Structure 1
Amino acid sequence: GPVPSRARVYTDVNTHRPSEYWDYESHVVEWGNQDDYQLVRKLGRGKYSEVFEAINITNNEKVVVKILKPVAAAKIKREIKILENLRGGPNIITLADIVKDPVSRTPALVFEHVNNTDFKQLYQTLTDYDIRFYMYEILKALDYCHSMGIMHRDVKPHNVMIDHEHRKLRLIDWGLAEFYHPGQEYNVRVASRYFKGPELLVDYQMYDYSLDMWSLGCMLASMIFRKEPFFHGHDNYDQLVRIAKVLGTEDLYDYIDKYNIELDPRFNDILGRHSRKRWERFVHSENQHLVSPEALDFLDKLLRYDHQSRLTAREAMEHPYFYTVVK
């Protein structure tokens, strides 16, 4: 069967802390007052919630209200416990309150409001300096949650709010987040397709915080190369083939061999044989201003098949790519 794996950092976080820290099922929710909030406009709806802009009438402040759709009671308590555990952490969205919505009869999570700058505007105009600056801010959020024994598992651009005017960033939507317990087998049906780590794509369940570092590398590659998304799979199988056309099939086979993973036989007809490509292949006159030897070296250290070989968030923060960032 598969060779077991454990993170190379923060393995003992959930053993050192008390059971009440990670046993989200035993957590008792402290309910706020729904009457303190007035919904202003619907901002969006995903598979698990409807999101609104609202006002806290007790202090007249703007808030964001996430009304959860009826789902397994386990997923709800998990998100709340993770949000409370991480509250106050650098660049972590602040959970301000939990109320029972009178209409849905489900919990409604109230967050601090972030004036999110238009995604297209950010993607099209952030500078090389700005990309390094915001990447450093995301790393502060990731190292903080990992150090707190939690993996986000849904790192993608739509989960990173940026108020560019105030140079403020928040990592949001902790609905797919989980506590990391060494030896635990997790569900591989996490993260959005283009951000899924090879571990998920080859159905290796004993993954860890390093999955977030792969997703972070996908975001960086898309930004600096002006290719959105970087690995553009038509499905979860074609997603692995798209990665293999860049990183090569020989390192893919070394990875699955290391962990005694057998690829799903449906890959026989679609994978093929691909050499590893040099990152300079993706450089051109329309993205050269965002590329540097430091950027390519950093990307190379995130986008590795072997989850145990990727930079951790804390190691990533001392990479030369961030030397130019004012600290």
Structure 2
Amino acid sequence: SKARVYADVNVLRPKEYWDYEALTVQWGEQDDYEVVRKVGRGKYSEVFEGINVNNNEKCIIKILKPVKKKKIKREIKILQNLCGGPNIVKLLDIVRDQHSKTPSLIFEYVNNTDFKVLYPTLTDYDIRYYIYELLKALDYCHSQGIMHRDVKPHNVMIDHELRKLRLIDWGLAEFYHPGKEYNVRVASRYFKGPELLVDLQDYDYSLDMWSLGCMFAGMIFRKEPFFYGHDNHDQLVKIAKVLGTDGLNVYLNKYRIELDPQLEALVGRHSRKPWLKFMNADNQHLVSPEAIDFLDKLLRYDHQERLTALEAMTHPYFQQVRAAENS
């Protein structure tokens, strides 16, 4: 399996672009930034609201609990490579304690409203608008040879007053190299693509499109999380009860995958459930034939069949958003 789009990006670019293990950092002034309060909490990180003590502007400060040098370098190099791209969080500085050398990444501040509060207030047009903004970010990182691998509402900062969206938390992100077999312990359970759940290791940018689909379904139907599995095995079961097992069996056969017999028995046999069965009186103002058709073109077992971020942006569901972005 190889990516349909952007497959050879990292071949064409200089080795220094993607060879993050070779990164040297030019460390900024640690004293320029102070930590004000915790916005919590990592496993390696803690994140804080901070202040730039020069201009008094707010920032966000992520202190990287000490840390495999390799993953720190990966995150920094990716952030540097993407800085300036549309709707990508901006890494403003990189500093560290002169003695313990504890690094802190310094980000632009976004006045976020948590999705559990914000999403219930969004209109039909608001969802269209923000999903389009998110697709800009994904097409950009993909075009730059990078997979995000942790798309979810928790990683999408929105300042609703400012109509401003940023994709954050690039700590799971990776460079795409054709035929490379990646770690499947990526993304959050409810957002894991079928490829991760069946251990198809040579996945690509299209993983982010499945995740985006899960998020989208949650938003338009108000069923969050949309695929609500109790463990990684049950996650595949929940997906199967909706898309149906016919498509799952064809997918497994195509990529020459055989499920562990235990997981096969758990999945069972199911018919496809039509998307309209999720519509109800509470969510019907967010649901349209174009929303359903867009959803349907993202949530495919076969990662090769999913819309690319670029293709997604051409979907009729976005027609009014594109119309306003006009002179």
Q: Is the shorter-chain TM-score for this pair beyond 0.5, marking a shared fold?
A: yes
**Greater mean alpha carbon deviation, residues 50-59 or residues 206-215:** 50-59
Answer with 306-315 or 111-120: which moved more: 111-120
Residues 1:126 and 2:122 are matched in the alignment: yes
Residue 9 of structure 2 corresponds to 13
SS at match of 1:40: strand
After TM superposition, the structure 1 = structure 2 runs for residues 134-283 of structure 1, keeping only pairs within 5 Å, are 134-283=130-279
Select 1:287's aligned residue among 283, 289, 298. 283
Report if aligned partners of 1:154, 1:191 keep a CA contact under 8 Å in 2. Answer: yes
Segments of structure 1 that go 5 or more residues without pairing to the other structure are none
Aligned to 1:50: 46
Deviation, 1:187, is 0.2
What SS does the aligned partner of 2:296 have? helix
Residues 1:27 and 2:26 are matched in the alignment: no
| Contiguous gaps of at least 5 residues in structure 2 | none
Q: Alignment length, in residue pairs?
A: 323
Partner of 1:319: 315
Instruction: State the distance in 2 between where 1:123 and 1:304 align.
Output: 25
Give 1:70 shift. Answer: 1.6
Cα separation, 2, equivalents of 1:146 and 1:268: 33
Alignment partners' CA distance in 2, 1:32 and 1:206: 37
Q: In structure 1, how many angstroms separate the alpha carbons of the residues matched to 2:223 and 2:317?
A: 20
Q: Which residue of 2 aligns with 1:83?
A: 79
TM-score (structure 2 length as normaliser): 0.97
* TM-score (structure 1 length as normaliser): 0.97
Hey, what's the Cα distance between the residues in 2 that align with 1:214 and 1:44?
27
Instruction: Show the 5 A alignment for 1:59-98.
Output: 59-98=55-94
In the superposition, relative to structure 1, how do residues 104 and 246 fare at CA in structure 2: closer, same or farther (>3 Å)? farther
Q: Which amino acid aligns with 1:133?
A: Y
Q: Distance in 2 between matches of 1:125 and 1:103?
A: 47
Query: Following TM superposition, by how much is the alpha carbon of 1:102 offset from its aligned partner in structure 2, in angstroms?
Result: 6.0
> 1:268 offset after TM fit, Å?
3.4
Q: Deviations over 1:178-226 (max 9, x none)?
A: 0000000000000000000000000110000000000000000011111
Q: Distance in 1 between matches of 2:29 and 2:160?
A: 32
Identical positions, percent: 76
Q: Deviation string for 1:7-58 (max 9, x for gaps)?
A: 0000111011100000000111110111001111111112220001111112
Q: What's the CA shift for 1:104?
A: 6.4
Structure 2 residue matching 1:99: 3-state secondary structure = strand
Q: Which residue of 1 aligns with 2:113?
A: 117
Q: Which amino acid in structure 1 is aligned with residue 256 of structure 2?
A: N
How far apart are the structure 2 equivalents of 1:114 and 1:278? 38
2 CA distance for matches of 1:103 and 1:65? 19
CA-based RMSD of the aligned residues comes to: 1.0
Task: State which drifts further: 118-127 or 69-78.
Answer: 118-127
The 3 A distance-change label for structure 1 pair 88 and 270 is same
Deviations 1:218-271 (A, max 9, x none): 000011111010000000000000000000011001001100011122213311
**3-state SS of paired residue (1:59):** coil
Flag the 1:208–1:155 CA change in 2: closer, same or farther, 3 A: same
Look up the SS of the partner of 2:93 in the other structure. strand
Report the more deviating stretch, 180-189 or 52-61: 52-61
> Are the equivalent residues in 2 in contact too, given 1:67–1:101 (CA < 8 A)?
no
- Aligned-pair distance for 1:127? 0.4
Q: Per the alignment, in what secondary structure is the counterpart of residue 324 of structure 1? A: helix
